[PDB]
Structures are given as structure tokens and as C-alpha cells.
């Protein structure tokens, strides 16, 4: 149980992720390396609640002086982001499959009162069977406790995926915001492109979308069935926006491919 550090698998703010393999049992893991010179105690506290096949497995922590260590399931398939060919995307049947799994993961987190708050292709990893795994709970927080919803007010995430209500509202519900980001993801997957830099009335592309101008990119690359689902998800008003139970009833979602 001396995981030795075979190779860097990436970098970041915090620090890096190493491919730590055992040498006796040879069991691979991803290890997160975080120079504390928070946040870390919340991400662990959260990683400790999680158990699901579309959520990235948490194994342990190790304080070790100045550097925190997170032993997390290894995803040798890499990021969904690299399965998205620019300007093209991917085959509709692969996208549907990744959406299915993504929704199973999100349902699961929401079910236990947790919101991820930064859903994007970069944070969706793929194992060697290409199974989608939600990764990175550093922006993640509790929106439900003792069966009692708390609204959010900390603005965070990544702007091209963030829902309009969180740029414009003092406080807002957690669940629609993940719902929106999942639809920006789906768009990326079917088009190879992000529609806007941000969902704000000062962004031409976003104003073009609200005006149902879907003869522009990205939308013209998207077949009508998935596009009608995107019409229900990317609803500006978070109360009018589609919920996950209803996403699961939608025609494209249930289309055999
Ligand atoms: C990024 N985290 C930690 C979050 O769980 C990972 N976790 C668990 N397994 C993983 O496999 C990877 C990975 C897989 C293939 C190539 C490169 C990396 C990565 C990876 C991804 C990007 C950057 C850094 C690392 C990864």
C-alpha cells in the first residue's frame, strides 16, 4: 500500500493529479495533490457521501504535512472534452448515451441534496468502457438538508455553461442551474461548439437564441429531435425550465439509436 507515482495525468490550480499505481497489487488510482499554501475539507466531506456508477469514486485522504491527497477512481478514457471534435461534435448515438449517464449521475447527486455547480466536458471523465463519471466536487455544495431546500447566492462555475439566473439574481435554486449546464454540454456534443460566452442580454448569440433564430450555428447542425429538447432546457426562466423527470420523458431522450 505504497502507491508510487507512475506519471502525471494533469495539472491545475490546487496542484496536479498523478497516476499512482500500486506495485504489489498493481491497482491504478488517480491522486489529487493540493498545496494548502477549506474547500478541501468540503470537497472531501462531499466526496465521502458519494456512491454511484456515474460519479467518480472517492477512496481516501492523506493530510501529509502541507499537501492534501485525494485517492479517486482512475478514468483511463480521459475527458469527454477530447471526444468532442471541434465544429463537428460526435455521432448522435454516442451523445445520447453520454447524456443518459450524465442524467443518471445528476439525478443521483440532487437526490442526496448535492449540486455539482460546474458541469462541463472537462469534468466528465470516461473509464475504459467509456462510461461517463462526474468528477471534481470543489465547487459542489449542499442545497438540500433535513428535506429543506436552501437557495444559493455564491455565483460560480464556468461562464459558457452557467445559467442566466445566476448572473441576474440575488438568490436562485440549485437544480435548474445543473439542468442548464447539462444542456450546454449536450449542445457541445452535437455541434462541436459552445453557443455563447455567457447567457446575458448583452451577448448577441444568446439574444439570437431567445429570438428562436435556429438557422444559425450551433443549432442548424443539430437534428430537430434533440433540438426540441434543447428548447425545453435552455429556457431563460428557471421556473419554466424543464426538470430531469421530464427530460426522461422527452422524445429524443427515448429515441432508439
Ligand atoms: C482529473 N482527475 C481527478 C478528478 O477525479 C482524474 N481523476 C480520475 N481519473 C483520471 O484520469 C485522468 C486522465 C485520463 C487520461 C489521460 C489524462 C488524464 C484524469 C485527468 C484528466 C485530465 C487532467 C488531469 C487528470 C483523472
Coordinates of C-alpha atoms and ligand atoms in Angstrom, one line a residue:
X1 CA 0.0 0.0 0.0
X2 CA 2.8 2.4 -1.0
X3 CA 1.2 3.8 -4.1
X4 CA 4.2 5.1 -6.1
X5 CA 3.6 7.9 -8.6
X6 CA 3.9 6.4 -12.2
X7 CA 3.1 9.6 -14.1
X8 CA 1.4 13.0 -14.1
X9 CA -2.1 12.7 -15.7
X10 CA -2.7 16.5 -15.4
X11 CA -2.3 20.0 -13.8
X12 CA -4.5 22.7 -12.2
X13 CA -4.9 25.4 -9.5
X14 CA -4.7 23.2 -6.4
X15 CA -1.7 21.3 -7.9
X16 CA -1.7 18.1 -10.0
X17 CA -3.1 14.6 -10.5
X18 CA -0.7 11.7 -10.6
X19 CA -1.4 8.2 -11.8
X20 CA -0.5 6.4 -8.6
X21 CA -0.2 2.6 -9.2
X22 CA 0.5 0.1 -6.5
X23 CA 3.5 -2.2 -7.2
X24 CA 2.3 -5.3 -5.2
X25 CA -1.4 -5.4 -6.3
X26 CA -0.8 -3.0 -9.3
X27 CA -4.1 -1.2 -8.7
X28 CA -4.1 2.1 -10.5
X29 CA -5.7 5.3 -9.0
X30 CA -5.8 9.0 -9.7
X31 CA -4.3 11.0 -6.9
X32 CA -5.0 14.7 -6.3
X33 CA -2.1 16.8 -4.9
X34 CA -3.1 20.1 -3.2
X35 CA -0.6 22.6 -1.7
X36 CA -2.6 24.3 1.0
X37 CA -0.3 27.4 0.7
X38 CA -11.3 24.8 3.1
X39 CA -12.8 24.0 0.2
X40 CA -10.6 21.0 0.6
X41 CA -12.4 19.9 3.7
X42 CA -15.8 20.4 2.0
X43 CA -14.7 18.5 -1.2
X44 CA -13.7 15.6 0.9
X45 CA -16.7 15.8 3.1
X46 CA -18.7 15.7 -0.1
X47 CA -16.6 13.0 -1.8
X48 CA -17.3 10.9 1.3
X49 CA -21.1 10.9 0.7
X50 CA -20.9 9.8 -2.9
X51 CA -21.6 6.3 -4.2
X52 CA -22.7 5.9 -7.8
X53 CA -21.5 4.3 -11.1
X54 CA -21.6 7.7 -12.9
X55 CA -19.8 9.6 -10.1
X56 CA -16.1 9.4 -9.7
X57 CA -15.2 7.0 -6.8
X58 CA -13.6 8.5 -3.7
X59 CA -11.1 6.2 -1.9
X60 CA -9.3 8.2 0.8
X61 CA -7.5 11.3 2.0
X62 CA -4.0 11.8 3.5
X63 CA -3.0 15.1 5.2
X64 CA 0.8 14.6 5.0
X65 CA 2.1 17.9 6.3
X66 CA 1.4 20.7 3.8
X67 CA -0.2 18.7 0.9
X68 CA -3.6 17.0 0.9
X69 CA -4.1 13.7 -1.0
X70 CA -7.3 12.5 -2.7
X71 CA -7.4 9.0 -3.9
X72 CA -10.0 8.9 -6.6
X73 CA -11.1 6.4 -9.2
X74 CA -9.0 6.5 -12.3
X75 CA -10.6 7.2 -15.7
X76 CA -8.3 5.9 -18.4
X77 CA -10.8 7.1 -21.1
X78 CA -9.9 10.7 -20.3
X79 CA -12.2 13.7 -20.6
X80 CA -15.4 13.9 -22.6
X81 CA -13.9 17.1 -23.9
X82 CA -11.5 15.1 -26.2
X83 CA -14.3 13.1 -27.7
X84 CA -15.8 16.4 -29.0
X85 CA -14.3 17.0 -32.4
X86 CA -14.4 20.9 -32.9
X87 CA -17.1 22.2 -35.2
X88 CA -18.5 18.6 -35.6
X89 CA -19.1 17.0 -32.2
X90 CA -19.8 13.3 -32.3
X91 CA -22.3 10.8 -33.5
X92 CA -25.8 11.4 -32.1
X93 CA -26.0 7.8 -30.7
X94 CA -22.8 8.3 -28.6
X95 CA -24.1 11.7 -27.4
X96 CA -27.4 10.3 -26.3
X97 CA -25.6 7.6 -24.3
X98 CA -23.4 10.2 -22.6
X99 CA -26.4 12.3 -21.8
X100 CA -28.3 9.3 -20.4
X101 CA -25.4 8.6 -18.0
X102 CA -24.9 12.3 -17.2
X103 CA -28.5 12.5 -16.1
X104 CA -28.3 9.4 -14.0
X105 CA -25.3 11.0 -12.2
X106 CA -27.1 14.3 -11.7
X107 CA -30.3 12.7 -10.5
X108 CA -28.2 10.9 -8.1
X109 CA -26.5 13.9 -6.6
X110 CA -29.7 16.0 -6.5
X111 CA -31.3 13.1 -4.8
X112 CA -28.8 13.4 -1.9
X113 CA -29.2 17.2 -1.8
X114 CA -25.9 18.0 -3.5
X115 CA -25.3 20.3 -6.6
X116 CA -22.1 20.0 -8.7
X117 CA -22.2 23.6 -10.0
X118 CA -19.5 23.1 -12.6
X119 CA -20.7 20.5 -15.1
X120 CA -18.7 20.7 -18.3
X121 CA -16.9 18.2 -20.7
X122 CA -13.6 18.8 -18.8
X123 CA -15.3 17.5 -15.6
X124 CA -16.9 14.4 -17.3
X125 CA -14.4 11.6 -17.4
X126 CA -14.7 8.3 -19.2
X127 CA -13.5 5.0 -17.9
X128 CA -12.0 2.2 -20.1
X129 CA -15.5 1.0 -21.1
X130 CA -16.2 4.7 -22.0
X131 CA -18.6 5.1 -19.0
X132 CA -19.2 8.7 -18.0
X133 CA -18.1 9.7 -14.5
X134 CA -18.7 13.0 -12.9
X135 CA -15.6 14.4 -11.4
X136 CA -14.5 17.3 -9.2
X137 CA -16.5 18.4 -6.2
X138 CA -14.5 21.6 -5.3
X139 CA -17.4 23.9 -6.3
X140 CA -20.0 21.5 -5.0
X141 CA -22.4 22.3 -2.1
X142 CA -25.5 21.2 -0.2
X143 CA -28.7 22.7 -1.5
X144 CA -31.0 20.2 0.5
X145 CA -30.7 19.2 4.2
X146 CA -33.2 17.7 6.5
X147 CA -35.6 17.7 3.5
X148 CA -35.3 21.6 3.4
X149 CA -34.1 23.4 0.3
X150 CA -31.6 26.3 0.7
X151 CA -31.2 28.7 -2.2
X152 CA -27.8 29.6 -3.5
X153 CA -26.2 33.1 -3.8
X154 CA -22.5 32.4 -4.4
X155 CA -22.0 32.9 -8.2
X156 CA -19.8 30.2 -9.6
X157 CA -18.9 27.8 -12.3
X158 CA -17.6 28.4 -15.9
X159 CA -19.4 31.2 -17.8
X160 CA -20.4 29.4 -21.2
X161 CA -22.2 26.7 -19.0
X162 CA -23.7 29.0 -16.3
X163 CA -27.5 29.6 -16.2
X164 CA -28.9 33.1 -16.8
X165 CA -30.5 33.4 -13.3
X166 CA -27.1 33.2 -11.6
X167 CA -25.8 36.3 -13.4
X168 CA -29.1 38.2 -12.7
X169 CA -30.5 37.0 -9.3
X170 CA -29.6 37.6 -5.7
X171 CA -30.6 34.0 -4.9
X172 CA -31.7 31.1 -7.1
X173 CA -32.4 27.3 -6.9
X174 CA -29.6 24.8 -7.4
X175 CA -31.3 22.3 -9.6
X176 CA -32.1 24.3 -12.7
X177 CA -28.6 25.6 -12.8
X178 CA -27.2 22.0 -13.3
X179 CA -30.0 21.3 -15.7
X180 CA -28.9 24.2 -17.9
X181 CA -25.2 23.3 -17.8
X182 CA -26.1 19.7 -18.9
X183 CA -27.8 21.2 -22.0
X184 CA -24.9 23.4 -22.9
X185 CA -22.9 20.1 -22.7
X186 CA -25.3 18.3 -25.0
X187 CA -25.0 21.2 -27.4
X188 CA -21.2 21.0 -27.4
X189 CA -21.5 17.2 -28.1
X190 CA -23.9 17.5 -31.1
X191 CA -22.2 20.6 -32.7
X192 CA -18.6 20.7 -31.6
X193 CA -19.2 24.3 -30.4
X194 CA -20.4 26.4 -27.4
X195 CA -23.3 28.7 -28.4
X196 CA -22.4 31.8 -26.3
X197 CA -19.7 33.1 -24.0
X198 CA -22.4 33.8 -21.5
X199 CA -26.3 33.9 -21.1
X200 CA -26.7 37.6 -20.7
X201 CA -28.9 40.1 -22.6
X202 CA -25.6 41.8 -23.8
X203 CA -24.5 38.6 -25.8
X204 CA -25.5 38.6 -29.4
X205 CA -25.6 34.8 -29.7
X206 CA -27.8 34.4 -26.6
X207 CA -30.2 37.1 -27.9
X208 CA -30.3 35.2 -31.2
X209 CA -31.2 32.0 -29.4
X210 CA -34.1 33.6 -27.4
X211 CA -35.4 35.0 -30.7
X212 CA -35.6 31.3 -31.9
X213 CA -33.1 32.0 -34.8
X214 CA -32.0 28.4 -35.1
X215 CA -30.9 28.7 -38.7
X216 CA -27.7 30.0 -37.2
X217 CA -24.9 27.8 -35.8
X218 CA -24.7 25.9 -33.5
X219 CA -28.4 25.0 -33.9
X220 CA -28.5 24.2 -37.7
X221 CA -26.0 21.3 -37.1
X222 CA -28.5 19.7 -34.6
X223 CA -31.3 17.5 -35.6
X224 CA -34.8 18.6 -34.8
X225 CA -35.5 15.9 -32.1
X226 CA -32.5 16.8 -29.8
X227 CA -33.0 20.5 -30.7
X228 CA -36.6 20.4 -29.2
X229 CA -35.1 19.0 -26.0
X230 CA -32.6 21.8 -26.0
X231 CA -35.5 24.3 -26.5
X232 CA -37.0 23.0 -23.2
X233 CA -33.7 23.0 -21.3
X234 CA -32.3 26.4 -22.3
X235 CA -35.4 28.3 -21.1
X236 CA -34.3 31.5 -19.6
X237 CA -36.8 31.4 -16.7
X238 CA -35.7 28.7 -14.3
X239 CA -39.3 28.1 -13.2
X240 CA -40.4 27.4 -16.8
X241 CA -37.2 25.3 -17.4
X242 CA -37.6 21.5 -17.9
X243 CA -36.9 19.2 -15.0
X244 CA -35.0 16.0 -15.0
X245 CA -38.1 13.8 -14.6
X246 CA -39.5 15.5 -17.7
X247 CA -36.1 15.2 -19.6
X248 CA -36.6 11.5 -19.1
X249 CA -39.9 11.6 -20.9
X250 CA -38.7 13.6 -23.8
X251 CA -38.8 12.1 -27.4
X252 CA -35.2 12.3 -28.4
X253 CA -34.1 11.1 -24.9
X254 CA -36.2 7.9 -25.5
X255 CA -35.3 7.6 -29.3
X256 CA -33.6 4.3 -30.1
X257 CA -30.1 4.9 -31.8
Ligands
LIG1 C1 -8.6 14.8 -13.3 N1 -8.9 13.7 -12.3 C2 -9.2 14.0 -10.9 C3 -10.7 14.1 -10.6 O1 -11.3 12.8 -10.2 C4 -8.9 12.4 -12.7 N2 -9.5 11.5 -11.8 C5 -9.6 10.2 -12.1 N3 -9.0 9.7 -13.2 C6 -8.5 10.5 -14.1 O2 -7.9 10.1 -15.3 C7 -7.5 11.2 -16.0 C8 -6.8 11.2 -17.2 C9 -7.0 10.1 -18.1 C10 -6.4 10.0 -19.3 C11 -5.4 11.0 -19.7 C12 -5.2 12.0 -18.8 C13 -5.8 12.1 -17.6 C14 -7.7 12.3 -15.1 C15 -7.3 13.6 -15.5 C16 -7.8 14.2 -16.7 C17 -7.3 15.5 -17.1 C18 -6.3 16.1 -16.4 C19 -5.8 15.5 -15.2 C20 -6.3 14.3 -14.8 C21 -8.4 11.9 -13.9

